[PDB]
Each structure stands twice: as structure tokens, then as C-alpha cells.
Design a protein around this ligand. Sequence first.
Ligand SMILES: *[C@@H]1O[C@H](CO)[C@@H](O[C@@H]2O[C@H](CO)[C@@H](O[C@@H]3O[C@H](CO)[C@@H](O)[C@H](O)[C@@H]3O)[C@H](O)[C@H]2NC(C)=O)[C@H](O)[C@H]1NC(C)=O
Ligand SMILES: *[C@@H]1O[C@H](CO)[C@@H](O[C@@H]2O[C@H](CO)[C@@H](O[C@@H]3O[C@H](CO)[C@@H](O)[C@H](O)[C@@H]3O)[C@H](O)[C@H]2NC(C)=O)[C@H](O)[C@H]1NC(C)=O
Ligand SMILES: *[C@@H]1O[C@H](CO)[C@@H](O[C@@H]2O[C@H](CO)[C@@H](O)[C@H](O)[C@H]2NC(C)=O)[C@H](O)[C@H]1NC(C)=O
Ligand SMILES: *[C@@H]1O[C@H](CO)[C@@H](O[C@@H]2O[C@H](CO)[C@@H](O)[C@H](O)[C@H]2NC(C)=O)[C@H](O)[C@H]1NC(C)=O
Ligand SMILES: *[C@@H]1O[C@H](CO)[C@@H](O[C@@H]2O[C@H](CO)[C@@H](O)[C@H](O)[C@H]2NC(C)=O)[C@H](O)[C@H]1NC(C)=O
Ligand SMILES: *[C@@H]1O[C@H](CO)[C@@H](O[C@@H]2O[C@H](CO)[C@@H](O)[C@H](O)[C@H]2NC(C)=O)[C@H](O)[C@H]1NC(C)=O
Ligand SMILES: *[C@@H]1O[C@H](CO)[C@@H](O[C@@H]2O[C@H](CO)[C@@H](O)[C@H](O)[C@H]2NC(C)=O)[C@H](O)[C@H]1NC(C)=O
Ligand SMILES: *[C@@H]1O[C@H](CO)[C@@H](O[C@@H]2O[C@H](CO)[C@@H](O)[C@H](O)[C@H]2NC(C)=O)[C@H](O)[C@H]1NC(C)=O
Ligand SMILES: *[C@@H]1O[C@H](CO)[C@@H](O)[C@H](O)[C@H]1NC(C)=O
Ligand SMILES: *[C@@H]1O[C@H](CO)[C@@H](O)[C@H](O)[C@H]1NC(C)=O
Ligand SMILES: *[C@@H]1O[C@H](CO)[C@@H](O)[C@H](O)[C@H]1NC(C)=O
Ligand SMILES: *[C@@H]1O[C@H](CO)[C@@H](O)[C@H](O)[C@H]1NC(C)=O
Ligand SMILES: *[C@@H]1O[C@H](CO)[C@@H](O)[C@H](O)[C@H]1NC(C)=O
Ligand SMILES: *[C@@H]1O[C@H](CO)[C@@H](O)[C@H](O)[C@H]1NC(C)=O
Ligand SMILES: *[C@@H]1O[C@H](CO)[C@@H](O)[C@H](O)[C@H]1NC(C)=O
Ligand SMILES: *[C@@H]1O[C@H](CO)[C@@H](O)[C@H](O)[C@H]1NC(C)=O
Ligand SMILES: *[C@@H]1O[C@H](CO)[C@@H](O)[C@H](O)[C@H]1NC(C)=O
Ligand SMILES: *[C@@H]1O[C@H](CO)[C@@H](O)[C@H](O)[C@H]1NC(C)=O
Ligand SMILES: *[C@@H]1O[C@H](CO)[C@@H](O)[C@H](O)[C@H]1NC(C)=O
Ligand SMILES: *[C@@H]1O[C@H](CO)[C@@H](O)[C@H](O)[C@H]1NC(C)=O
Ligand SMILES: *[C@@H]1O[C@H](CO)[C@@H](O)[C@H](O)[C@H]1NC(C)=O
Ligand SMILES: *[C@@H]1O[C@H](CO)[C@@H](O)[C@H](O)[C@H]1NC(C)=O
Ligand SMILES: *[C@@H]1O[C@H](CO)[C@@H](O)[C@H](O)[C@H]1NC(C)=O
Ligand SMILES: *[C@@H]1O[C@H](CO)[C@@H](O)[C@H](O)[C@H]1NC(C)=O
Ligand SMILES: *[C@@H]1O[C@H](CO)[C@@H](O)[C@H](O)[C@H]1NC(C)=O
Ligand SMILES: *[C@@H]1O[C@H](CO)[C@@H](O)[C@H](O)[C@H]1NC(C)=O
Lengths: 118, 118, 118, 456, 51
Amino acid sequence: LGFLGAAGSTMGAASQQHMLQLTVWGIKQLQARVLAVERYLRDQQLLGIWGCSGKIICCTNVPWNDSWSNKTINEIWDNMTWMQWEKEIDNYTQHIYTLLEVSQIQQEKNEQELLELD
Amino acid sequence: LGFLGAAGSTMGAASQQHMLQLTVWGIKQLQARVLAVERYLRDQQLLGIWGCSGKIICCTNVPWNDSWSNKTINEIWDNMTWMQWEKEIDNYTQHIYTLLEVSQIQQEKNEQELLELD
Amino acid sequence: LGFLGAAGSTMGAASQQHMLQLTVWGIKQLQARVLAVERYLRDQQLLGIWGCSGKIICCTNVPWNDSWSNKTINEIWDNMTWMQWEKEIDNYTQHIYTLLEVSQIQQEKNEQELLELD
Amino acid sequence: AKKWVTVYYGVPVWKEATTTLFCASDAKAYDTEVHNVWATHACVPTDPNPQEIVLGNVTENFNMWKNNMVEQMHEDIISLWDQSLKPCVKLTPLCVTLNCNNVNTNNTGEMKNCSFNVTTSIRDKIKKEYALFYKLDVVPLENITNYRLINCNTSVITQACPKVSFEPIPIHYCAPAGFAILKCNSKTFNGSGPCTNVSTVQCTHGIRPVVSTQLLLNGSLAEEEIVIRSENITDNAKTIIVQLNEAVEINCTRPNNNTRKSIHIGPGRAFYATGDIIGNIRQAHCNISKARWNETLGQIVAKLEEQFPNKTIIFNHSSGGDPEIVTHSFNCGGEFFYCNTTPLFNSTWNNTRTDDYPTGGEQNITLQCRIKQIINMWQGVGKAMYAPPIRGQIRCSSNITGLLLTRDGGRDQNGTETFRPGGGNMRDNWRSELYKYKVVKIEPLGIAPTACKRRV
Amino acid sequence: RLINCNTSVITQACPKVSFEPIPIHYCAPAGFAILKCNSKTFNGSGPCTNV
Ligand SMILES: *[C@@H]1O[C@H](CO)[C@@H](O[C@@H]2O[C@H](CO)[C@@H](O[C@@H]3O[C@H](CO)[C@@H](O)[C@H](O)[C@@H]3O)[C@H](O)[C@H]2NC(C)=O)[C@H](O)[C@H]1NC(C)=O
Ligand SMILES: *[C@@H]1O[C@H](CO)[C@@H](O[C@@H]2O[C@H](CO)[C@@H](O[C@@H]3O[C@H](CO)[C@@H](O)[C@H](O)[C@@H]3O)[C@H](O)[C@H]2NC(C)=O)[C@H](O)[C@H]1NC(C)=O
Ligand SMILES: *[C@@H]1O[C@H](CO)[C@@H](O[C@@H]2O[C@H](CO)[C@@H](O)[C@H](O)[C@H]2NC(C)=O)[C@H](O)[C@H]1NC(C)=O
Ligand SMILES: *[C@@H]1O[C@H](CO)[C@@H](O[C@@H]2O[C@H](CO)[C@@H](O)[C@H](O)[C@H]2NC(C)=O)[C@H](O)[C@H]1NC(C)=O
Ligand SMILES: *[C@@H]1O[C@H](CO)[C@@H](O[C@@H]2O[C@H](CO)[C@@H](O)[C@H](O)[C@H]2NC(C)=O)[C@H](O)[C@H]1NC(C)=O
Ligand SMILES: *[C@@H]1O[C@H](CO)[C@@H](O[C@@H]2O[C@H](CO)[C@@H](O)[C@H](O)[C@H]2NC(C)=O)[C@H](O)[C@H]1NC(C)=O
Ligand SMILES: *[C@@H]1O[C@H](CO)[C@@H](O[C@@H]2O[C@H](CO)[C@@H](O)[C@H](O)[C@H]2NC(C)=O)[C@H](O)[C@H]1NC(C)=O
Ligand SMILES: *[C@@H]1O[C@H](CO)[C@@H](O[C@@H]2O[C@H](CO)[C@@H](O)[C@H](O)[C@H]2NC(C)=O)[C@H](O)[C@H]1NC(C)=O
Ligand SMILES: *[C@@H]1O[C@H](CO)[C@@H](O)[C@H](O)[C@H]1NC(C)=O
Ligand SMILES: *[C@@H]1O[C@H](CO)[C@@H](O)[C@H](O)[C@H]1NC(C)=O
Ligand SMILES: *[C@@H]1O[C@H](CO)[C@@H](O)[C@H](O)[C@H]1NC(C)=O
Ligand SMILES: *[C@@H]1O[C@H](CO)[C@@H](O)[C@H](O)[C@H]1NC(C)=O
Ligand SMILES: *[C@@H]1O[C@H](CO)[C@@H](O)[C@H](O)[C@H]1NC(C)=O
Ligand SMILES: *[C@@H]1O[C@H](CO)[C@@H](O)[C@H](O)[C@H]1NC(C)=O
Ligand SMILES: *[C@@H]1O[C@H](CO)[C@@H](O)[C@H](O)[C@H]1NC(C)=O
Ligand SMILES: *[C@@H]1O[C@H](CO)[C@@H](O)[C@H](O)[C@H]1NC(C)=O
Ligand SMILES: *[C@@H]1O[C@H](CO)[C@@H](O)[C@H](O)[C@H]1NC(C)=O
Ligand SMILES: *[C@@H]1O[C@H](CO)[C@@H](O)[C@H](O)[C@H]1NC(C)=O
Ligand SMILES: *[C@@H]1O[C@H](CO)[C@@H](O)[C@H](O)[C@H]1NC(C)=O
Ligand SMILES: *[C@@H]1O[C@H](CO)[C@@H](O)[C@H](O)[C@H]1NC(C)=O
Ligand SMILES: *[C@@H]1O[C@H](CO)[C@@H](O)[C@H](O)[C@H]1NC(C)=O
Ligand SMILES: *[C@@H]1O[C@H](CO)[C@@H](O)[C@H](O)[C@H]1NC(C)=O
Ligand SMILES: *[C@@H]1O[C@H](CO)[C@@H](O)[C@H](O)[C@H]1NC(C)=O
Ligand SMILES: *[C@@H]1O[C@H](CO)[C@@H](O)[C@H](O)[C@H]1NC(C)=O
Ligand SMILES: *[C@@H]1O[C@H](CO)[C@@H](O)[C@H](O)[C@H]1NC(C)=O
Ligand SMILES: *[C@@H]1O[C@H](CO)[C@@H](O)[C@H](O)[C@H]1NC(C)=O
């Protein structure tokens, strides 16, 4: 569990083989394995459609709207400690996902094809 | 279900937390979850070996053989409505998969390595 | 099973729809499907964090330490037949994984961001 | 010039399939932690915004009786009826010899006062017990009338629990990810034809599992016309499903104030019999309206006279049989009613008019129901069920929306065709609601030629 | 008569079946985690500062 070690640091300072038996401890282990594989794949599925498939830091082409937040870059990268920043923009997040889905990939793939016919 | 909205348009115009109980509604839900995860991963596994891993429009290096179809580009991109085009080339599809597997990736990876030793 | 055909060659010469019933043959098939999907995803998860997400031949930026092996390139690419090479460096492998995880990706992503602010 | 292969993902192509569908109820129930029979613990909560994509110019082909959703639902209702009454009381020590006499009101006898020796909870002593129970639950064994219980030759018999409800709450059917359900939006669509207005859903209609014969009660309605479906309408062995456009309301009741005993047989197992009747002893009538059903029966025949366009058509009652086959049988509050429909299928229709209903009488056609305790619905050969008595009075107020018919023979008597209410299958109840759904399978990966190529 | 044979079905436990309380660890699946209080004097229903 390599995460969570910088859970209090600021945002910039963090820069076996057993036959399946249907008994009461077998059902729980099977449910745990299916939960783990689904919860991994939904995050990979979200990262795939944004062009950020195999990266951990991914820049985009979506400009930042000031209705989401009015703060400054060095104001939030030096004070805010990711739990608080996640509680701040929690209302605006789903909308931002849609802007990552269209305006950075749908306009990037099709136009790329228009360069390939030369 | 964001697909299927252009199912009649032409081809160019479309440019909770419950303990797992083994009762009669629990078995069906578990089977549905395993079906969903397998049916996602086989399509991602096919796209991975063609060099088209995180894209929705992917160009290749396989020339189009006229034994597959004799039609024109603007003849099929303006009239044909994907169900009909899928019924047309249904016999030739598996062979084409093999040409995507070898002649665009096996010849692309090895030769790329021959450029990296400089 | 397209692998294993060059299991004796040298290292350079290899250049249906059934309702889920919880009976004694149903439990085995369900366990087999969950084993297959997990064993695929752990290898894809290892390849993802090394920047080698959708490739089969992937070069890196980790220099080869001679404490791992002292042999020559054309000495091991012409004689050694992958089973033997895997038995040779089996003690040093986990450490090498860590050097692929940090010194080729953590130093590549962050520095890439330092080029994007221009 | 110089075409090249190109791969797309997210392409609207479907094929036909057969998969596993799962339940979906909603959170207008599920406030109390109770367990009825149609589980609804394990039903996923449905979405308050169900999406319907209207397709374009698609002309998908459907079938009303080559559907696999019906075969899944018929097995998901039999199986779910056996989770309950698996941890319940077997009535094997009740298969004994019964003495009796008759209750003081005959034909209203339909009750019997019975006495029997029982081996009690302590396996040395013999107790003697009394219970009232109905006729149609007995068989005469060989003067003193000395009989026994109906179904001890051939089945193991199981008392259902009280505090286990039977109320038919709706069931949605969902398909997993990578599948979809297609829906027909045509106004008057028969069985087995093409369509022109098709839509896609993830989740079907609110289907209610009403177990019923001879009539379809809390169902769904057509639009602007009554519609008749059949497989091959010229053949007589195929059943006919009639769907109405205006519902006909019906008001059953059972006036009695009967009580319940509690005979304790075996350790921790109580047997709930029927005690005494407080007050008068009456019938169990039902009262369908008369002027309201006359119009319905008269506009069924306007569509029936087109398929057989010379002959006069008449309606005749059913033929002999078990009382659970030839009568309208249904469930109401916990009892099982068995009313006969000879006052309904009675008449003769020459030219969409009749002489069989006078207008010189009164309205409110009556029906005589009857009660039965031992019920073996779905015709399992070795299983039955004992429904314990409800104390108080019972009322139904059902909402009739369609019916089942079958023809008789091909013998040329006259220009005369007899229809009889006789649809002999339980699947026919659930083809009436699943007629417009078909499960497909999404194939999102496409190959097409265009003029683009990779670079090195 | 015996103590409980008019209200319950009664079942003999087998010999060679042990009752000894061996310890149980509770593990959470991947994607979850368990937090832990390290305060020396901690009541119920409060905050912490050493987690
Ligand atoms: C339940 O078990 C009891 C056990 O006593 C049964 O009682 C039986 O009752 C009959 C009728 O009174 C007895 O018959 C006797 O016959 C002699 C000779 O004819 C006559 O002189 C007596 O006056 C009397 O009628 C019988 O002995 C008695 N006991 C047994 C063991 O049969 C009772 O009939 C059982 N009930 C049912 C429904 O099985
Ligand atoms: C078909 O079903 C109907 C019931 O809907 C049967 O009709 C019923 O016939 C009886 C006797 O013919 C009627 O009772 C009589 O009413 C008249 C006038 O009120 C009275 O003078 C008589 O003394 C007697 O009370 C009864 O009203 C009638 N039912 C209804 C609802 O009107 C009929 O017998 C069945 N069969 C055939 C072949 O029609
Ligand atoms: C059914 O028959 C039994 C015959 O024993 C009746 O039970 C007796 O009824 C009388 C009259 O009320 C009471 O004095 C007795 O105490 C009852 N019990 C016994 C063991 O004799 C019973 O009432 C009858 N039930 C009906 C509906 O007729
Ligand atoms: C349901 O109605 C359709 C009409 O939309 C019927 O389909 C036609 O049936 C006739 C006679 O069998 C054929 O000649 C036509 O080719 C069919 N198609 C069309 C487009 O007209 C269908 O037979 C009807 N089904 C039943 C059971 O009556
Ligand atoms: C049902 O309709 C009947 C009319 O046919 C109502 O009347 C009584 O029905 C019983 C049942 O046979 C007869 O014994 C009475 O003589 C009838 N009385 C009269 C005045 O006709 C009956 O009340 C209706 N029930 C309901 C609940 O509406
Ligand atoms: C409804 O069907 C029954 C038979 O199922 C018909 O009853 C027969 O009627 C004729 C006419 O008098 C008698 O000769 C027969 O003996 C009757 N029984 C049988 C078994 O055939 C009855 O007539 C039919 N109803 C109508 C209105 O025709
Ligand atoms: C269905 O109910 C009707 C009620 O009218 C029954 O018809 C009559 O029942 C009486 C009972 O005394 C018979 O004497 C008559 O012969 C019956 N017929 C006619 C035309 O009056 C009918 O028998 C019932 N059917 C069943 C199967 O119980
Ligand atoms: C456990 O101790 C904490 C002290 O850290 C108590 O928390 C405070 O309780 C008082 C009185 O109820 C409140 O006014 C404060 O708002 C609480 N919080 C803080 C941060 O001081 C807590 O009530 C104690 N719990 C029990 C069951 O005694
Ligand atoms: C947001 O920031 C601007 C300037 O930084 C400031 O004037 C304003 O008060 C802030 N708050 C809101 C709610 O706009
Ligand atoms: C977020 O949404 C909630 C609910 O509408 C609202 O009360 C709150 O003011 C919003 N903004 C923040 C910063 O929480
Ligand atoms: C295919 O196309 C060519 C020219 O476009 C035409 O001559 C030929 O008839 C077509 N059909 C077949 C089966 O070759
Ligand atoms: C595809 O294969 C089938 C089966 O061999 C054949 O009948 C058909 O002519 C082929 N071509 C097309 C265009 O369907
Ligand atoms: C196996 O050994 C033979 C001679 O022993 C050699 O010629 C051959 O190349 C080797 N490899 C394979 C794959 O046959
Ligand atoms: C490793 O290689 C070097 C030179 O290639 C050689 O001198 C040495 O003996 C080898 N073995 C070890 C164990 O160092
Ligand atoms: C690998 O580790 C084992 C166990 O410590 C050791 O015996 C062996 O010498 C090591 N080296 C090789 C080449 O196997
Ligand atoms: C359906 O057909 C009409 C007329 O042929 C056409 O205008 C329309 O674009 C088609 N597609 C849809 C989605 O309506
Ligand atoms: C049931 O058993 C009795 C005798 O116990 C017999 O007379 C009767 O005919 C049997 N019924 C059936 C349907 O076998
Ligand atoms: C198809 O059915 C939908 C269902 O609401 C309706 O909105 C639409 O108007 C129908 N289309 C036609 C052409 O009747
Ligand atoms: C329908 O039934 C009639 C009468 O038996 C028969 O002749 C015919 O073959 C059946 N099928 C069709 C498709 O009409
Ligand atoms: C039925 O009998 C019970 C006996 O306690 C009585 O309380 C109740 O009022 C009766 N109901 C009617 C409708 O008479
Ligand atoms: C009945 O059949 C005759 C032919 O035998 C025909 O002349 C007549 O039109 C038919 N009746 C109707 C209402 O079609
Ligand atoms: C049916 O109606 C006709 C009038 O269309 C009439 O002449 C005839 O007598 C009636 N009855 C029969 C049995 O045909
Ligand atoms: C039944 O309908 C016919 C046709 O409208 C009518 O003549 C007759 O009077 C109706 N019967 C009653 C009882 O209303
Ligand atoms: C009986 O007939 C009357 C007509 O006056 C109607 O209002 C009433 O609803 C009918 N009863 C039932 C139970 O339908
Ligand atoms: C069983 O017997 C004991 C003593 O006779 C009594 O306390 C208990 O209530 C009895 N149980 C039942 C269900 O009668
Ligand atoms: C918090 O608890 C850990 C538990 O080992 C301890 O090592 C650490 O010193 C504690 N921190 C403080 C500030 O008490």
C-alpha cells in the first residue's frame, strides 16, 4: 500500500491454491476478488478515454474555468493537502469529466486522421 | 448507453453493498458481473496487439485487398449504414485480423529496435 | 497457444451460454474464469507502470549493473535458451523491477511536465 | 486511391444472443426488513432516470413465442417459490384417518368438522384434535363417514409460513453490460413480424407476477384497439391471447369471521388450522358488471368475424376437469379462489348482436367462488402447499385486462365456430407482457478502408 | 423429561471437533484500507491525532 504516506503533506510537497468451496469463508474471498478486479478496471476505463492510458501525470487541452475555482496556482499547490481540494471542487467534477472526454480526445483523434491523408 | 444513437444513420453521417448470498437473485447478479468484465477485456485484448491500445480511431499499415470488396470509398462512406457493411465482409474478417497482428506490429516493433541501437 | 514453439531454440533464434448452476462442474468453471482474468491483469498492471503499456519489445533507461551478470551480449543472445537465463538472474529480479519503476518513469513523467510549461 | 485498413471502436452493431437477466426493484418498498417470496432484498435499486434511445430507420424483426425471456421467467418463478417453504413445516404426521361430521349449513356441506388422533411433541402420548376444513381437501376412504386428506397418496405437503407475503410487487429485467433490450413501439403489432419504430432500453417494464388462469388481472392495456394475437390462427391447437384497451373492474369478497387454532405437532412446529366461524355462514361471490362487459364481448367479435368471415361464432363453457383447470383460479390476500365462469361464456353471436342477455333483468353478473387449502399450482407431482387461514374478511378489487381462448375441433357442424376459455399453460400469462422485448448483443469493433496510414 | 424438547430441535456436537479460540485477523480487499487509533488514552466517539 504505497499510497497514503503523504496524506498530511501539502499538495506540492508530495511531488493460495485452494479448491473453491462454498462455505462462509469461501464466499467472502470470492466476493473480495471480484470487487478488486472491478474497482481496478473502472479507473483504467476512465483513464483510457482521456488519452491518459499508461501515465500517472497527464496534461490536457481543457482550459480552466474560473467558476470552478478562483484561486491561484501557488495558492493551492502550497497549502491545501488533497483531501481539502477534493472537498472543494466536489460539485463540479462530473462536468469536467465530460470536457475531458470530448474536447481533448474527440477533437484530437478525428483531426489527427485529417493529417494522415496528407 | 451512449452508443446506438446513430444505428440508422449512414456510415459518414455518424462522424449496492450487499453480502453475497447464494440465492436465486444472487447467482444471477454474480454471473452478470463476470460476463461484463470478460466481455470488456476480450475487446481490449484484441486492440492491444494491433498497436491501437488507447484510441478509438486507429490507422494501420495493411493495404486493402480488392478481393475483400471492390467498392469505392465515397460509395461505402455515404450509403451503407454499419449493419449492412458488417454483413458484407463477415466472411473475410478473421483473416484480416491476422494481417493486423503480424504485418503492422511484428514488423513495426522489431524494426523499431533496429533503430534504437543507432 | 501461440507461445512455447521456440522453447528449445536459442534466445536470438526466437527473434457456452449456460445458466450458472452451483454443481461440481460449475464451480470449477467459475474458478477457472476468475483465475484467467486475474492472471492477465497482474501482467498488464506490471507493464503499465514501466511505460511499456501496449508493446511487446520495450527499451528503457536503466543501465545494466555487472553484479547481476558479467557475460557478453552476443554470449547470451546466441547460446542460452530463455529457461536457463531465467534460472540465472532469478535472485536479482525484484530489485530490477524497482529500478524500472522509479528511475525510468518517475524521473520521466515529472521532467516531461517541466518541459510543457515551456 | 491507395486504400488502407482502419480500426474503429464504438460502432453500433448488434447480433442476437441469449444471456442471464437479473432483477431490479425500487426503493418505494424496502423500508421494513421483511422477506416475502419474490425476494427483493437482492434486487438492485432501479434508476430514477431510465434512458430510452429512439433508434433511426431500423426494421428489426420480432417474435412473440420464440422468445427466451419467457423461458427464463417461468423458471425464475418456480425456483423462487421454493426458497420459501424449504425452511417450513412438513405435514407428514397429518396423513391419518379422519372422523367427521357436517357443519349445520349445507352448500354454503362445504365445511367439515374433523377429529383425529395425533402423536404430540413428546413421543409417547396420544392427543385428540378437532379442526374445520373445506370440501375439495378430502377424499372418502371407503354408517360413519370416515375419510382422509386429499394429497397423501402422491406428494410431500408443506405449510407455508405466516408473515410471508404473496403481494405481487413488480419486477424489472436488466441485461448486463455489453447487451441491450430492443423494444417495439408499433401501435397495433401482431406476433412474429417486422417493425419500423424500435427503441433500446437496459431495463424492462414493471411486470407483476400474477399467477392466474382464464383471465389476466392486473395487467397492461393496448392503445385505441383491442388486439388479438395467435401463432397460427387457422389451426385450433394454438391458444389465442386477447388484449383489451379498456379495463373491466371486478370486486371479489369472502364474508366470514373465521378464527385460527394452533395445534403443536413436533418440537418447535405449530400447525395452524381453522377454528370456528363467528356469525353467519355465507358464500364467496364476486360480481362482475354486466353492461360494461357486454360491450367488451361485443367488440371482441368484431375482430373475430374478420378471421372467419362467414360463420356465426358462439362462446361455450369449459369441459369437466379438475376445479383448478376449468375455473377462474387466483389469489387474493392469502386465500385461493376458484370461481366458475359459466355465466360468462354462455352466448351466441350471429351478426354482432345476441338474444342471450335480455336487458329485462338486472346488472352485476354474479359468480360462485370456492375456497381450497391444498394447492399444487404448476402441477408438480410430488410437492404441494398448505396455505394457512387468514382471520377477518377478504376483498380483492381486481382490474381485468385481457383473456385466453381456444377453439374446438374442425368438424363441420354448421356455419358455427365455438370458442372456449382454455389456455393450458403458465407461460401464456407472461407472453402477454414480454411480447415486445428482444435481447441483443453489442459488437463494438469495426474494420473499414480509408486513406490514412501510420508513420514510423 | 429433558429440558428443551418441546420448543427446539437438538443436535449433538461431534467429538474430534475443537472449540479452542484461535485468533482471527480481518483483512480488507484491494482498494480499501483500515485506519487505526494510536492514542494512549482514547474514549469512544471522538477525534484522534495519531492515525
Ligand atoms: C383414537 O384412539 C382412540 C384410542 O382409544 C380410539 O378409541 C377407540 O374408540 C372405540 C369406540 O369407542 C373403542 O371401541 C370399543 O369397542 C368395544 C367393543 O365393541 C365397545 O364395547 C366399546 O364401547 C367401544 O366402542 C376402542 O376400544 C377405542 N380404542 C382403540 C385402541 O381403538 C379412537 O377411535 C381413535 N380415533 C381415531 C380417529 O382413530
Ligand atoms: C346466460 O347467463 C344469464 C345470466 O347473465 C342467464 O340469464 C338469467 O336467466 C334467469 C332465468 O331465465 C333470469 O331470471 C329471471 O328474471 C326475470 C325478469 O327479471 C323474472 O321474471 C324471472 O322470474 C327470473 O327472475 C335472470 O335475470 C338472467 N340473468 C340476468 C343477469 O339477467 C341465462 O340463463 C344464461 N343462459 C342462457 C342460455 O341464456
Ligand atoms: C366440532 O365438533 C367438536 C366435537 O367435540 C366441537 O367441540 C366441542 O363443542 C362443544 C360445544 O361448544 C363444547 O362444549 C366442547 O368443549 C367442544 N370440545 C370438545 C373436545 O368436546 C366443536 O365445537 C365443533 N365445531 C363446530 C364448528 O361445529
Ligand atoms: C403479422 O403481420 C405481418 C405484416 O406486417 C405478417 O407478415 C406478412 O405475412 C404475409 C403472409 O404470411 C407475407 O406474405 C408477407 O411477406 C409478410 N410480410 C409483410 C411485410 O407483409 C405476418 O405474417 C403476421 N403474423 C401473423 C402470425 O399473422
Ligand atoms: C353482488 O350482487 C348481488 C346481486 O346479484 C348483490 O345481492 C345479493 O347477492 C347474494 C348472493 O347470491 C344474494 O343471496 C342476495 O339475495 C342478494 N341481494 C339482493 C338484494 O339482490 C350482492 O349484495 C352484491 N355484492 C356486492 C359485494 O356488491
Ligand atoms: C357446449 O358444449 C357441450 C358439449 O361439450 C354441448 O352439449 C351437447 O349438446 C347437445 C345438444 O343437445 C347434446 O346432444 C349433447 O348430448 C351435449 N353433450 C355433449 C357431450 O355433446 C353444448 O350444446 C354446447 N353449447 C352450445 C350452446 O352449443
Ligand atoms: C357453474 O355455475 C353454474 C351456476 O349457474 C352451474 O350451473 C347450474 O348449476 C346447477 C346446480 O344445482 C345445476 O343443477 C344446473 O344443471 C347447472 N346448469 C344450468 C344451465 O343451470 C354449473 O353447474 C357450474 N359449473 C361447475 C363446473 O361447477
Ligand atoms: C470523548 O472525548 C472527547 C474529547 O476529545 C469528547 O468530545 C467533546 O465532547 C464535548 C462534550 O460532549 C463537546 O462539547 C465537544 O464538541 C467534543 N469534541 C471536541 C473536539 O472537544 C467526547 O464527547 C467524548 N466522548 C464520550 C463518549 O465521553
Ligand atoms: C474569487 O476570487 C476573486 C479574485 O481572486 C475575488 O474577488 C472573489 O471575492 C472570490 N470569491 C468569489 C466567491 O467570487
Ligand atoms: C456544493 O453543493 C452543495 C449542495 O448543493 C452546496 O450546499 C454547496 O454550497 C456547494 N459548494 C461547496 C463548495 O460545497
Ligand atoms: C467489382 O467491381 C468491378 C469494378 O468496380 C466490377 O467490374 C465487378 O463486376 C464487381 N463485382 C465482382 C463480383 O467482381
Ligand atoms: C459468405 O459465406 C457464405 C457461406 O459460405 C456464402 O454463402 C456467401 O456467399 C459468402 N458471401 C457473402 C457476401 O455473404
Ligand atoms: C535442437 O537441437 C538440434 C540438434 O541437436 C538443432 O539442430 C536444433 O536447431 C535445435 N532446436 C530446435 C528448435 O530444433
Ligand atoms: C565474471 O566476468 C569476469 C570477466 O568477464 C571474470 O573475470 C570473472 O571471473 C567472472 N565471474 C565472477 C564470479 O566475477
Ligand atoms: C541465488 O540464491 C540462492 C539462495 O540464496 C543461492 O544459493 C544461489 O547461489 C544464488 N545464485 C544463483 C546463481 O542461483
Ligand atoms: C432516416 O430516414 C430519413 C429519410 O429517409 C433520413 O432523412 C434520416 O436521416 C434517416 N435517419 C434518421 C436517424 O432519422
Ligand atoms: C388415493 O388412495 C386411495 C386409498 O388410500 C385410493 O382409493 C384412491 O383411488 C387414490 N387416488 C389416486 C388418485 O391414486
Ligand atoms: C415511435 O415511438 C416513439 C415512442 O414515444 C414516438 O415518440 C415516436 O413518435 C414514434 N415514431 C413514429 C414515426 O411513429
Ligand atoms: C397453420 O395451420 C393450418 C391448418 O392446420 C396449416 O394448414 C398450415 O400449414 C399452418 N401453417 C401456416 C404457416 O399457415
Ligand atoms: C369478528 O370476531 C371478532 C372476535 O373477537 C370480533 O372482535 C370482530 O369484531 C368480528 N368482526 C366482525 C366484522 O363482526
Ligand atoms: C361467404 O362465402 C361466399 C362464397 O361461398 C361469398 O360469396 C360471401 O361473400 C362470403 N361472405 C362474406 C361476408 O364474405
Ligand atoms: C342470423 O342473422 C340473419 C340476418 O343477417 C338472419 O336472417 C338469421 O335468421 C339469423 N340466424 C341464423 C341462425 O342464421
Ligand atoms: C348487450 O348489447 C346489445 C348491443 O348493444 C344490447 O342490445 C343489449 O341490450 C345489451 N344487454 C344489456 C343487458 O344491456
Ligand atoms: C354493479 O352495477 C352497478 C350499476 O348500477 C355499478 O355501478 C357497480 O359498480 C356494479 N358492481 C360492481 C362490483 O362492479
Ligand atoms: C414446554 O414445557 C415447559 C414446562 O412444561 C413450559 O415451560 C414451556 O412453555 C413448554 N413449551 C411449550 C411450547 O409449550
Ligand atoms: C503515534 O503512534 C506510534 C505508534 O507506534 C508512535 O510510534 C508515535 O510516536 C506516535 N506519535 C506521537 C506524536 O505520539
